[PDB]
Swiss-Prot record, chain A:
Mitochondrial membrane ATP synthase (F(1)F(0) ATP synthase or Complex V) produces ATP from ADP in the presence of a proton gradient across the membrane which is generated by electron transport complexes of the respiratory chain. F-type ATPases consist of two structural domains, F(1) - containing the extramembraneous catalytic core, and F(0) - containing the membrane proton channel, linked together by a central stalk and a peripheral stalk. During catalysis, ATP synthesis in the catalytic domain of F(1) is coupled via a rotary mechanism of the central stalk subunits to proton translocation. GO terms for cellular component: mitochondrial inner membrane; mitochondrion; proton-transporting ATP synthase complex. The gene is ATP3. PANTHER family: ATP SYNTHASE GAMMA CHAIN, ATP SYNTHASE SUBUNIT GAMMA, MITOCHONDRIAL. Belongs to the ATPase gamma chain family. Changing residue 264 to F: In allele ATP3a. This is ATP synthase subunit gamma, mitochondrial.
Swiss-Prot record, chain B:
InterPro entries: ATP_synth_F1_esu_mt, ATP_synth_F1_esu_sf_mt. F-type ATPases have 2 components, CF(1) - the catalytic core - and CF(0) - the membrane proton channel. CF(1) has five subunits: alpha(3), beta(3), gamma(1), delta(1), epsilon(1). CF(0) has three main subunits: a, b and c. This is ATP synthase subunit epsilon, mitochondrial. One of its GO terms (biological process) is proton motive force-driven ATP synthesis. It comes from the Eukaryota. The lineage of its organism: Eukaryota, Fungi, Dikarya, Ascomycota, Saccharomycotina. It is found in: Mitochondrion; Mitochondrion inner membrane. GO terms for molecular function: proton-transporting ATP synthase activity, rotational mechanism. Disulfide bonds: none annotated. Signal peptide: none annotated. It comes from Saccharomyces cerevisiae (strain ATCC 204508 / S288c) (Baker's yeast). Belongs to the eukaryotic ATPase epsilon family. Gene3D superfamilies: ATP synthase, F1 complex, epsilon subunit superfamily, mitochondrial (1.10.1620.20). Present with 4280 molecules/cell in log phase SD medium.
UniProtKB/Swiss-Prot annotation, chain C:
This is ATP synthase subunit 4, mitochondrial. It comes from Saccharomyces cerevisiae (strain ATCC 204508 / S288c). Coiled coil: none annotated. Mitochondrial membrane ATP synthase (F(1)F(0) ATP synthase or Complex V) produces ATP from ADP in the presence of a proton gradient across the membrane which is generated by electron transport complexes of the respiratory chain. F-type ATPases consist of two structural domains, F(1) - containing the extramembraneous catalytic core, and F(0) - containing the membrane proton channel, linked together by a central stalk and a peripheral stalk. During catalysis, ATP synthesis in the catalytic domain of F(1) is coupled via a rotary mechanism of the central stalk subunits to proton translocation. The modification Phosphoserine is found at residue 4. Belongs to the eukaryotic ATPase B chain family. It comes from the Eukaryota. F-type ATPases have 2 components, CF(1) - the catalytic core - and CF(0) - the membrane proton channel. In yeast, the dimeric form of ATP synthase consists of 17 polypeptides: alpha, beta, gamma, delta, epsilon, 4 (B), 5 (OSCP), 6 (A), 8, 9 (C), d, E (Tim11), f, g, h, i/j and k. The lineage of its organism: Eukaryota, Fungi, Dikarya, Ascomycota, Saccharomycotina. It is found in: Mitochondrion; Mitochondrion inner membrane. Present with 12900 molecules/cell in log phase SD medium. The chain holds residues 141 to 192 of 244 of the full protein.
Curated annotation (Swiss-Prot), chain D:
This is ATP synthase subunit beta, mitochondrial. The modification Phosphoserine is found at residue 101. Present with 164000 molecules/cell in log phase SD medium. It comes from Saccharomyces cerevisiae (strain ATCC 204508 / S288c). Keywords: ATP synthesis, ATP-binding, CF(1), Hydrogen ion transport, Ion transport, Membrane, Mitochondrion, Mitochondrion inner membrane, Nucleotide-binding, Phosphoprotein, Transit peptide, Translocase, Transport. One of its GO terms (molecular function) is ATP hydrolysis activity.
Length: 265, 48, 52, 120
C-alpha cells in the first residue's frame, strides 16, 4: 500500500549498502598489492630520474593520462580531467592519448581534436610492464612521439592513504639529452645513439610508474568513496526506519475506524 | 618496433622457468585491444 | 598617436546628436499626457455605460 | 460577496483563512445531528456540503469573482478527502509545505506542486 512501498525502498537502500560493504572489503585486499608494486616501480624509475636530473633538462605536444575503464572509484576520473584540461589551455587542439575509456568521453566533448589514440582493457588489470611496453611502441609508430618537444604524463598521486591529488611528471624527449646544460659529463661520440634508445625505453618505464601511482590512488579512493557511501546509505536506513514505524501505526488506526463504523450500523 | 619492445620480448622468453609466480606471467602476457582513433571518428579496435 | 586624437574629435561631435534626441523624447511625454487623459476619460464613460 | 456580485457591477475579491475550518466544523457537528461519520473523521455529507459554498463562488455575467482560498492541512496529509476534493473545484494552487520551509526558501511554495488552468 503505502506500507509495502516503504518496505521495498528500505530494501533497495539495504541491497546498495550490502554491495558497498562488499566492495570496500575487496578494495582493501587489492590495495595492499597496489601500494607494494608502486614502491618498486618508483624506485626503478628513480634510478633513471637520477640521470635526468644530473644531466639537467630542457624538456604539437602530447598528453597522456591513466584511468580506469570501469566506472566508480571516487572522483579519480574527473579530477584527472580538470588537470588535463589545464594544460590544454596552451594549444586547444592538442593530442591526448587516453589510457582509460572514461576520461576519453569527457575530453571528446571539451575539444574534439584531442582524442587520437586510445587504449582499452587496462582498467581490470594491474600496473604491469607488458601493457606499458606495447602502448609505448605503438606511441612512436602512430603518434610519432619522438617529434614532440614536450611529453607529459598525468596520474593521480596517492598523497596520503585517504587522499589523491592529480599529479604529473614529464617524459623526457630524446631532444632533451642532446642540448641540456650537461652532456659533457655524459660525453659521447659514436659509441652509442643513447638519445633515440634511452628515450624509447623511458617512455615505457615513466609511463608505468604513472600507471602504478594512478592504480594505487584509484583503489584507495575507491575504498574511501564506498566507505562514505555505506555511511550515507545508513543514514537513509535510519530515517526510513522512523517512516516504517509511523507507516505501521497509521494502517492499524485507519483500519479500526472502518470495522467500528460497520459494526455500529 | 623499438629498442624497449626488443627488451620486452627478451623479458617474454624469460617468463617461461616454471618456478616463477603469476604476476611475472602478467608482466609478460596481456590480451587487450587498443581502440584506434582519429579526428570523434574511430577505426575499429585491434589486439595490443 | 593619430588614432587617439581622431577618436576625440569624431566622438565629441556625434554624442551631441544623442544628447538632443533623448531630451526631445521627454518633451513628447508632455504631449503623451493629453493621450493618457483621453483614455481615462473614455474608459470612465464606457464603464458607466456598461453598467447601464 | 453576492450583493456586490449582483446589484453592482464593481470589482470583487475574496480572501479566506481557512475554509478547511468550515470543513472541520462539519466533522464536529456530524455525530450530534444524527449522521454516521465516514472514514478519517470527515462528514458523510462532504461532497454536497462542500458543493453548495463553492457554487456560490462562481463567475456570472453580472460580474467576475477572483477568489483566493486557504485550506489548513492537518498532519500535512494532503491525501485525506477534505484537502483532496478541493482541487477539482480549483483552477490554480500554489501549495506551501514544511519541507521548503526548512530549506529556508520563503515563499514556501512547492515549485513542482503548482498548477493552473492558464498554463498553455
Amino acid at each position: 500500500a503505502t506500507l509495502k512501498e516503504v518496505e521495498m525502498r528500505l530494501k533497495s537502500i539495504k541491497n546498495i549498502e550490502k554491495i558497498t560493504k562488499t566492495m570496500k572489503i575487496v578494495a582493501s585486499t587489492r590495495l595492499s598489492k597496489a601500494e607494494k608494486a608502486k614502491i618498486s616501480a618508483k624506485k626503478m624509475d628513480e634510478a633513471e630520474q637520477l640521470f635526468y636530473k644530473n644531466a639537467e633538462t630542457k624538456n604539437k605536444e602530447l598528453i597522456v593520462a591513466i584511468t580506469s575503464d570501469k566506472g566508480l572509484c571516487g572522483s579519480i576520473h574527473s579530477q584527472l580531467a580538470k588537470a588535463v584540461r589545464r594544460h590544454l589551455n596552451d594549444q586547444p587542439n592538442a593530442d591526448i592519448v587516453t589510457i582509460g575509456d572514461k576520461i576519453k568521453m569527457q575530453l571528446l566533448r571539451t575539444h574534439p581534436n584531442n582524442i587520437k589514440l586510445s587504449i582499452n582493457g587496462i582498467g581490470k588489470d594491474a600496473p604491469t610492464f607488458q601493457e606499458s611496453a606495447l602502448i609505448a611502441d605503438k606511441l612512436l609508430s602512430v603518434m610519432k612521439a619522438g617529434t614532440y618537444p614536450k611529453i607529459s604524463i598525468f596520474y593521480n598521486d596517492p598523497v596520503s592513504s585517504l587522499s589523491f591529488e592529480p599529479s604529473e611528471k614529464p617524459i623526457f624527449n630524446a631532444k632533451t639529452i642532446e642540448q641540456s646544460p650537461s652532456f659533457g659529463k655524459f660525453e659521447i661520440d659514436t659509441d652509442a645513439n643513447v638519445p633515440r634508445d634511452l628515450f624509447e625505453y623511458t617512455l615505457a618505464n615513466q609511463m608505468l610508474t604513472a600507471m602504478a601511482q594512478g592504480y594505487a590512488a584509484e583503489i584507495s579512493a575507491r575504498r574511501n568513496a564506498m566507505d562514505n557511501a555505506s555511511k550515507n546509505a545508513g543514514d537513509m536506513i535510519n530515517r526510513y526506519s522512523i517512516l516504517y514505524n509511523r507507516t505501521r501505526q497509521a494502517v492499524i488506526t485507519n483500519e479500526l475506524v472502518d470495522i467500528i463504523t460497520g459494526a455500529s450500523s | 618496433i623499438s629498442y624497449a619492445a626488443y627488451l620486452n620480448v627478451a623479458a617474454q622468453a624469460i617468463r617461461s622457468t616454471e618456478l616463477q609466480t603469476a604476476s611475472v606471467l602478467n608482466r609478460s602476457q596481456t590480451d587487450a585491444f587498443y581502440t584506434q582513433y582519429k579526428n570523434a571518428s574511430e577505426p575499429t579496435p585491434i589486439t595490443k | 598617436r593619430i588614432d587617439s586624437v581622431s577618436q576625440l574629435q569624431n566622438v565629441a561631435e556625434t554624442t551631441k546628436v544623442l544628447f538632443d534626441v533623448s531630451k526631445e523624447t521627454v518633451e513628447l511625454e508632455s504631449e503623451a499626457f493629453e493621450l493618457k487623459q483621453k483614455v481615462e476619460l473614455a474608459h470612465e464613460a464606457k464603464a458607466v455605460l456598461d453598467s447601464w | 460577496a453576492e450583493y456586490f456580485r449582483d446589484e453592482e457591477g464593481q470589482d470583487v475579491l475574496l480572501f479566506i483563512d481557512n475554509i478547511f475550518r468550515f470543513t472541520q466544523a462539519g466533522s464536529e457537528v456530524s455525530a450530534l445531528l444524527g449522521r454516521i461519520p465516514s472514514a478519517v473523521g470527515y462528514q458523510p455529507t462532504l461532497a454536497t456540503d462542500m458543493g453548495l459554498l463553492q457554487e456560490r463562488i462562481t463567475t456570472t455575467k453580472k460580474g467576475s469573482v477572483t477568489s483566493v482560498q486557504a485550506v489548513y492541512v492537518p498532519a500535512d496529509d494532503l491525501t485525506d478527502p477534505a484537502p483532496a476534493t478541493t482541487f477539482a473545484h480549483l483552477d490554480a494552487t500554489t501549495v506551501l509545505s514544511r519541507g521548503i520551509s526548512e530549506l529556508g526558501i520563503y515563499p514556501a511554495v512547492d515549485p513542482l506542486d503548482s498548477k493552473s488552468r492558464l498554463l498553455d
